[PDB]
Amino acid sequence: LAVSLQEALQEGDTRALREVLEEIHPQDLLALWDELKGEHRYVVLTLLPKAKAAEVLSHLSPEEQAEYLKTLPPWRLREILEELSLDDLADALQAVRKEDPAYFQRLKDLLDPRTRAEVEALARYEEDEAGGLMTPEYVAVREGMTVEEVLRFLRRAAPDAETIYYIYVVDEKGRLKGVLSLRDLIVADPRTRVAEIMNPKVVYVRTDTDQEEVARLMADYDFTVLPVVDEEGRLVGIVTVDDVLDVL
Amino acid sequence: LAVSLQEALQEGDTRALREVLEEIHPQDLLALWDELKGEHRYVVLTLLPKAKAAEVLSHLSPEEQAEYLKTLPPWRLREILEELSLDDLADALQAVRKEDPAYFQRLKDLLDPRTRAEVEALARYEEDEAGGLMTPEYVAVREGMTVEEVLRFLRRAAPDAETIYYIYVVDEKGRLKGVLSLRDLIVADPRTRVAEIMNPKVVYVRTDTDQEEVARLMADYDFTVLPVVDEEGRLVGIVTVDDVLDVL
Ligand SMILES: [Mg+2]
Ligand SMILES: [Mg+2]
Ligand SMILES: [Mg+2]
Ligand SMILES: [Mg+2]
């Protein structure tokens, strides 16, 4: 699928192109990416199935990110943007914002209202602090819920969640009460309460906490996921280790 | 629980000491660790519940690791060592080996035969290559197994596994056929075959692959777990991202 693409490209074989794009793995494409003329990068980001396109763009430089969000057709932008994880959308928007703040406003208007309001709260936080790294696509439950109710829930929430391997616990006010893992859930009795299984001394970070600290905290405790709260102690999101590895 | 310890320490209050150690979190202890006299580091590694002691020692420098494996009583060493994850045991043994190869042989003899043979294959690989980072404590299944059989299996394997969030697939010969996630398993129908759910294009690494490459591969694909094979394409272990974060 590697060069077997530049075959469809140099040729102008749309049929063959679309076919290779249906199964080309995002990383396989991100590889030979420096070896693609400008015209070809544009066509691929156009014809690629939207989810993969979002994936690719999410891994490009922010200057490249901003250039394609400014040159790709609005119908296509609509598609790519709605496929981005929230934290990746914010970074992609902030990329454009830096260059053209007016078009940033346009990009946000192309979003679905539910999506648009979410990024807005996000895109604001300092981009080198917990808020600028986190995503609100986590799973939270109450401590009164049983394991059976949570597992049932997770199957429903899985498709959109950043992860379901770490499940946070909150109260009526939305404040962090503890942490739970999919592993514990899987071995526990379906009748067991979540409070009888959670770890009440969950370690967390603030929305303004420096990214150095988030990285250090995640390396020390060996977490793959860390919760992020606001000034009122309420769960507002999670940071995952893949995004910490990138901060280096 | 922080300084509330140095209280039992400076006093010589074994009862109080053991009590604080029953609930002192490993990282909470690893913190005020530079602020502990030699005598106190020794007592804590002695009285701490074995699992936590293994945890603490696993995070100390390799020179400190080797000094305590040479000064702690054999009955206690027996306990700590059997609580270490395999990859951590190998590194702890290699630490001592560098200083005193003879005592390394003693340390290995204190292990349980099943444990001893396992570390031996491990402790040999280059410690800056996949082999020197991996652990054989992963979960593998066949592609003919159903989801129900795998979930049943995982509950049984959970307690010792490094993780059960990524389940590898092998054949009769033990060679890597694909990868699967706990997430997919949870949403899939219990009757579904594993081959109808796995990703056949699993990305993997060799036992001799450089650790730079393991880190890069894990950062690019955003994996939290990567499989490691030998020269015959057989699954011999996994590397987890927490150990890659440490390689920096
Ligand atoms: Mg961001
Ligand atoms: Mg992310
Ligand atoms: Mg090692
Ligand atoms: Mg490990």
Closest CA to B26 of B42, B48, B4: B48
Task: Compute the nearest-CA separation of B53 from chain A (Å).
Answer: 15
Residues linked to residue A176 through DSSP beta bridges, in sequence order: A170
Residue A155: both structure tokens together? 């199957």
Q: Which of A29, A139, A187 is the mutation pick for testing B, counting most B CBs within 10 A?
A: A187
- Pairing state between β A176-181 and A166-170: antiparallel
Q: Distance, CA B54 to ligand 2 centroid (Å)? A: 32
Superfamily covering domain B1-125: MgtE N-terminal domain-like (1.25.60.10)
Which experiment gave this structure? X-ray
Residue A224: what residue type?
T
Resolution (A): 2.3
Nearest CA in chain B to A165: B165
State the Cα–Cα distance between residues B106 and B72, nearest whole angstrom. Answer: 13
Q: Which CATH number fits domain B126-248: 3.40.50.10260, 3.40.50.10470, 2.140.10.10, 3.10.580.10?
A: 3.10.580.10
Q: Who surrounds ion ligand 3 at CB < 5 A?
A: B 90-91, 132
State the Cα–Cα distance between residues A43 and A45, nearest whole angstrom. Answer: 6
The angle subtended at Cα A220 by Cα B213 and Cα A150, nearest 5°, is 95
Do residues A245 and B241 lie in contact, with contact meaning Cβ atoms separated by under 8 Å? yes
DSSP helix/strand/coil, B51 = helix
* Count of CB pairs separated by less than 8 Å, A with B: 67
Residue A176: both structure tokens together? 């962090």
Closest CA to A122 of A109, A135, A113, A111: A135
Sorted by where each begins, the domain ranges of chain B are 1-125, 126-248
- Backbone conformation region of residue B158, classed left if phi is above 0, alpha if psi is from -120 to 50, else beta: alpha
Which among B155, B186, B223 has CB closest to A158?
A: B186
DSSP helix/strand/coil, B23 = helix
DSSP run (H or E) holding A140: strand A140-141
Helices (H), B32-146: 38-47, 50-58, 62-71, 74-83, 86-99, 101-110, 113-124
Closest CA to A77 of A93, A61, A62: A93
Establish whether A230 is an annotated binding residue: no
State the Cα–Cα distance between residues B12 and B10, nearest whole angstrom. Answer: 6
Which among B59, B158, B222 has CB closest to A183?
A: B158
- Please judge whether A245 and B183 are an interchain contact, meaning their C-beta atoms are less than 8 angstroms apart: no
Q: Distance, CA A164 to ligand 2 centroid (Å)? A: 14
DSSP state of A45: H
Establish whether A166 is an annotated binding residue: yes
Judging contacts by C-beta atoms under 8 Å, the chain B residues touching residue A164 are: 183, 186
- Residue B3, Cβ density class (10 Å: 0-12 exposed, 13-18 middle, ≥19 buried): exposed
Residue B147: both structure tokens together? 């989801």
Between the CA atoms of A59, A61, A64 and A69, what dihedral angle is there, to the nearest 10 degrees? Answer: 50
Closest CA to B248 of A247, A140, A71: A247
Do residues B134 and B238 lie in contact, with contact meaning Cβ atoms separated by under 8 Å? yes
Q: Which of B25, B165, B244 is the mutation pick for testing A, counting most A CBs within 10 A?
A: B165
- Please judge whether B220 and A182 are an interchain contact, meaning their C-beta atoms are less than 8 angstroms apart: no
DSSP run (H or E) holding B205: strand B205-206
DSSP state of B193: B
